Design a protein around this ligand. Structure first.
Ligand SMILES: [Zn+2]
Ligand SMILES: [Zn+2]
Ligand SMILES: [Zn+2]
Ligand SMILES: [Zn+2]
Ligand SMILES: [Zn+2]
Lengths: 48, 276, 248, 51, 148, 161, 98, 48
């Protein structure tokens, strides 16, 4: 798409994406966290 | 000129902190089995300082486009000289950086440290450093003005004498970061350990007004770069010639139409307005 | 599965070599682990690779570039964009509030539930273009240099809040060589300590206690360098009227 | 094509060879690789480009 | 064997080893000094660079002593390659065409780079920026290409 | 044919033993602040330490060998050295070698006056570990246990036993 | 702010211990209304509605907090939401017509 | 009450400092609206 502030068109892009070689001896990077579960989906009308 | 070395690696060898504990913890690289009070009061003097005339020069970062300034050059403890990969220079006004990094390439954060020390935050565009632990004399304003004018370009120096604290507001955030890293633990005309942190938001409502006005000035500058100058004139409407162009172009023929702003300024290749 | 990175953060080469690492970093905004995309830059700078720093969820919720964390519509920092056009959105930054908010927005967006600011910046430019006994003039004793050559400091009178030291120092630097320049907007005062006595004398003879700096009239004379204390409100008021009455 | 310097450029293999020649005497002396120690010893690919 | 034998079990080296033993010991002591070098003032890959440099130099001494200026018998050359005075795989690459000056096998190992590339030190310096001083992370080579 | 994956492919080579030696000497005890970015992997390789113990102890030298060289697979941190070998033997030859050890050991135990058993543990608890380069690297090894074979009777295995 | 943080902490400690207690939710929201934190009281009422979606007493408390503090449009939005949620509860319909 | 008295005396006699009782493992309910649930938009405007 255009730019932040520029609306001039610019060149089409070919991206080469490779998965990174990670060190096999590494443990996982980040400590896990306790987050309260989020609110439910908006409750439906009570059809009594 | 080439970048000169500031000190020598014979005293930039890497070695432990002095022993303040029973046993050295090799994971955290810290002494253990000691106390907590020692750490709180211990804040030593800086081991060096840098000079624009004497030390600042050229390096492989002046060769390489789009690199960062040298933090150890800012601290005056860079023995690398011309072989450093980071710029040995004060930033100018044309040296801008993205919010995610600072002038030294260190990542900025969503928050502040609770003592307002460190790299800084991208959640506040802070250009104001807070210099405490100043020896209270009468020439303190002159000394602060001289040293921080040596360290960069200033929009506002506000030095309090009661607690000996200088709030310095540079006009470039990179200048503020360089000044904080170059003035932390250094000394003015007296031998003192300066506590140079990031200043908090000013509770003075004049300063609040001027900071907010600068926010809208920067944002409107971005808007006017984004929009064509003719949409700018038509929307601004400070002059009657662009005002009457606004009525005619919004009329599009019919009298008394006054086209919606969305239709009239909807930019695109072929939307409505020939200004697009 | 593809980053939202802007064209200035992307390399100049149209053919991009990216590395992708699942759970590569913490998001700077929500502190959750996200897939990092990183690319080697343009100039073989030492540094690192330029990488995505926030998650795609935070980039969509703040309309930001995922590397530079700047607004995708104008090129502003997100805080500046939302402060000036504040009617877009707030955001939470307390600890578990921010992970909770990000997890709820991401779950909502992914399971389906949940261009907008033209009016906002049109209004911003409308607002920003909505704009915001008599003391004697200086005399021959005021523009004549005193015989005391130890007095080096010039004294500037009547400083508005929006008068900055960089242009003040540039003006006095293209005149002479400055040792120091103290400006207090709180008391509308300034002291100038020059380096050359001859340069200070010739500059003050050029200006004669009168100076036009950026549309602000300033009265410059000679005075002993004095610490600017906590002056009276009447003192700074009369100081301001003296600066205004420098020009008749 | 984008990344190498001298993109495009009508330039033949012979003048490849002279460009490499001028660059190879801009580089310093590799050494002899039958003298183990002292002056004249082999440095090979670790030879500095003189600037 | 290249495992150390007692003394009575030790078999003598071939002929010419008395002639080249001084240069071989020069390389060996150079390698021990590289082991004893300090690492505080330099980075970590830079700490490993001199081993690769000296290994290249020792193998080049053996290689050009046999192939270019013929001064050792084939029996002695095979014995040196077997007993660890020279790197047979590096010498094999030096025999290959377009690899006559390779710094190290890790620099042509393409399975171990991010985009399956060789290192930048193998690129003819004619295609790089002027005053772009390359010193590769693997061995610190400033240019290996045979044209270079 | 040489670029059937986009690039020129080559076999993985062996490095110099001095490279691995320099890596372990530099990291030492992991005490200098330089090696934090290695600390997470080093400790992570603890998960794989049982393989290293098995590979080393199965490739241990036999009593008739003074020293043995083994191929090792090492991490570039200096965190994990894995003996990448299988101690493959010709079973008749291995039988004959250990039978000759049985006979040689019995002769030596009948002929020794006093057998001083070596101490366990061989080193002190607080004594720092020895160095290859400064304590073992070029040191002359003692004689291994070897039968005196016969130039005529044991002629068929004499050179290589 | 010190006192308000202390009270907010004790209120949310009781919500974590027993979220099923309407009085826990009710006293928290009434205290924020007394502090004139209408966004905070609204948020408490909505989290209470997440726990008790079909509770007539809770819907009435929220609607009445808006009406008492003269947020008529907020209150009419709540009244539409409530008679959508509970269309056979004649109390909510009677409150809306009244 | 005693700590409040001491803090008021310090604030009266000049020095202002942030006595922060914020523990390890506690949210800042003053800092932010916790688990904020905004009222659903309806057919009536509520901006005023
Ligand atoms: Zn995020
Ligand atoms: Zn970007
Ligand atoms: Zn190499
Ligand atoms: Zn290389
Ligand atoms: Zn190379």
């Amino acid at each position: 798409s255009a730019q932040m502030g520029n609306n001039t068109k610019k060149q089409e892009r070919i991206i080469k994406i490779v998965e990174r070689q990670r060190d096999p001896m590494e443990p996982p990077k980040f400590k896990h966290k306790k987050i309260p579960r989020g609110p439910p989906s908006p409750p439906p009308p009570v059809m009594h | 000129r080439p970048a000169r070395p500031q000190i020598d690696p014979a005293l930039v060898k890497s070695e432990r902190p002095p022993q303040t504990g029973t046993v050295f913890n090799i994971w955290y690289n810290k002494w253990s089995g000691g106390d907590r009070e020692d750490k709180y009061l211990s804040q030593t003097h800086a081991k060096g300082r840098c000079n624009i005339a004497r030390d600042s020069g050229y390096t492989r970062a002046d060769s390489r486009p789009g690199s960062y300034f040298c933090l150890y050059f800012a601290r005056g403890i860079c023995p690398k000289g011309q072989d450093c990969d980071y710029l040995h220079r004060l930033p100018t006004i044309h040296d801008i950086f993205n919010p995610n990094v600072d002038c030294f390439g260190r990542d900025k954060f969503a928050d502040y440290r609770d003592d307002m020390g460190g790299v800084g935050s991208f959640n506040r565009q802070n250009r104001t450093i807070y210099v405490g632990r100043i020896h209270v004399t009468d020439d303190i304003e002159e000394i602060v003005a001289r040293h921080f004018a040596e360290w960069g370009q200033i929009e506002r120096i506000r030095v309090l004498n009661n607690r000996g604290v200088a709030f310095i507001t540079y006009t470039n955030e990179a200048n503020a970061q360089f000044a904080k890293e170059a003035m932390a633990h250094q000394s003015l005309d007296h031998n003192e350990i300066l506590n140079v942190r990031w200043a908090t938001a000013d509770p003075n409502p004049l300063a609040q007004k001027r900071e907010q006005r600068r926010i809208e000035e920067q944002a409107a500058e971005a808007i006017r770069r984004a929009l064509p100058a003719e949409f700018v004139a038509e929307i601004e409407g400070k002059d009657p010639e662009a005002r009457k162009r606004r009525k005619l172009e919004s009329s599009y023929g019919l009298e008394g139409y006054e086209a919606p702003d969305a239709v009239h300024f909807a930019r695109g290749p072929n939307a409505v307005n020939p200004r697009g | 599965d593809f980053p939202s990175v802007c064209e200035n953060c992307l390399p100049e080469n149209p053919y991009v070599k990216m590395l992708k690492e699942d759970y590569g970093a913490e998001c700077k905004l929500c502190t959750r682990p996200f897939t990092v995309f990183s690319w080697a830059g343009d100039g073989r700078a030492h540094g690192r690779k330029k990488r995505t720093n926030i998650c795609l969820t935070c980039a969509r919720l703040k309309n930001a570039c995922q590397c530079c964390i700047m607004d995708l519509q104008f090129g502003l920092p997100i805080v500046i964009r939302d402060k000036a056009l504040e009617l877009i959105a707030p955001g939470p930054q307390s600890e578990i509030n921010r992970e909770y908010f990000a997890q709820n927005n991401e779950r909502a967006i992914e399971e389906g539930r949940a261009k907008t600011d033209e009016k906002a910046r049109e209004l911003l430019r409308r607002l920003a273009n909505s704009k915001p006994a008599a003391l004697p003039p200086p005399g021959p004793k005021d523009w004549l240099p005193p015989a005391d050559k130890s007095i080096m400091s010039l004294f500037i009178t009547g400083i508005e809040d929006d008068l900055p030291e960089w242009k003040i120092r540039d003006f006095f630097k293209q005149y002479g060589k400055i040792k120091s320049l103290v400006v207090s907007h709180m008391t509308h005062c300034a002291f100038v300590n020059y380096e050359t006595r001859e340069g200070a004398e010739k500059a003050a003879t050029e200006l004669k206690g009168r100076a036009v700096i950026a549309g602000c009239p300033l009265r410059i004379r000679w005075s002993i360098p004095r610490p600017i204390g906590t002056m009276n409100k009447e003192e700074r008021a009369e100081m301001l009227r003296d600066g205004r009455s420098a020009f008749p | 094509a984008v990344e190498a310097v001298g993109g495009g450029v009508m330039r033949s293999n012979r003048e490849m060879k002279e460009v490499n020649k001028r660059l190879r005497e801009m580089r310093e002396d590799k050494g002899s690789a039958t003298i183990a120690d002292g002056e004249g010893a082999y440095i090979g690919p670790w030879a500095r480009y003189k600037r | 064997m290249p495992a150390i034998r007692p003394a009575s079990k030790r078999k003598p080296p071939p002929d010419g080893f008395s002639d080249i033993e001084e240069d071989l010991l020069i390389f060996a002591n150079k390698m021990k000094d590289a082991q004893n070098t300090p690492t505080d003032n330099i980075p970590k890959h830079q700490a490993q660079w001199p081993i690769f440099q000296i290994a290249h130099q020792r193998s080049r001494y053996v290689y050009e002593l046999y192939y270019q200026k013929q001064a050792i018998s084939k029996q002695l050359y095979d014995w040196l390659l077997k007993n660890g005075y020279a790197d047979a795989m590096l010498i094999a690459k030096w025999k290959k065409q377009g690899y006559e000056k390779l710094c190290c096998l890790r620099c042509i190992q393409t399975k171990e780079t991010n985009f399956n590339s060789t290192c930048i030190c193998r690129v003819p310096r004619a295609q790089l920026k002027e005053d772009q001083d390359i010193q590769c992370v693997n061995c610190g080579c400033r240019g290996c290409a045979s044209t270079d | 044919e040489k670029r059937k994956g986009g690039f020129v492919e080559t076999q993985k080579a062996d490095m110099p033993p001095e490279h691995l030696r320099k890596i372990v000497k530099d990291i030492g005890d992991v005490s200098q602040k330089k090696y934090t970015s290695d600390k997470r992997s080093y400790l992570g390789a603890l998960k794989f330490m049982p393989h290293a113990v098995l590979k080393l102890l199965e490739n241990m030298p036999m009593p008739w060998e003074a020293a043995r060289e083994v191929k090792v697979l090492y991490h570039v941190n200096g965190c994990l050295t894995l003996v990448n070998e299988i101690p493959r033997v010709i079973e008749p030859v291995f039988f004959a070698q250990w039978g000759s050890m049985w006979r040689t050991m019995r002769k030596e135990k009948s002929d020794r006056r006093l057998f001083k058993r070596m101490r366990f543990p061989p080193f002190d608890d607080e004594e720092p570990p020895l160095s290859w380069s400064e304590n073992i690297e070029d040191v002359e090894p003692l004689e291994p246990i070897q039968m005196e074979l016969d130039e005529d009777e044991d002629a068929a295995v004499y050179e290589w036993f | 702010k010190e006192y308000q943080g202390r009270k907010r902490r004790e209120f949310e400690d009781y919500i974590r211990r027993n979220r099923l207690r309407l009085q826990n939710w009710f006293q928290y929201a009434q205290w924020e209304l007394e502090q004139k934190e209408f966004a905070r009281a609204r948020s408490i009422f909505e989290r209470a509605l997440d726990v008790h979606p079909n509770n007539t007493q809770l819907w009435i408390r929220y609607i009445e907090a808006e009406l008492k503090n003269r947020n008529i449009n907020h209150a009419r939005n709540l009244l539409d939401r409530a008679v959508t949620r509970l269309p056979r509860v004649s109390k909510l319909w009677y409150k809306y017509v009244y | 009450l005693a700590a409040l008295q001491k803090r008021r005396e310090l604030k009266t006699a000049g020095i202002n400092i942030k006595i922060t009782t914020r523990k390890k493992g506690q949210m800042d309910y003053n800092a932010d609206i916790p688990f904020e649930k905004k009222p659903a938009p309806g057919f009536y405007d509520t901006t005023e």
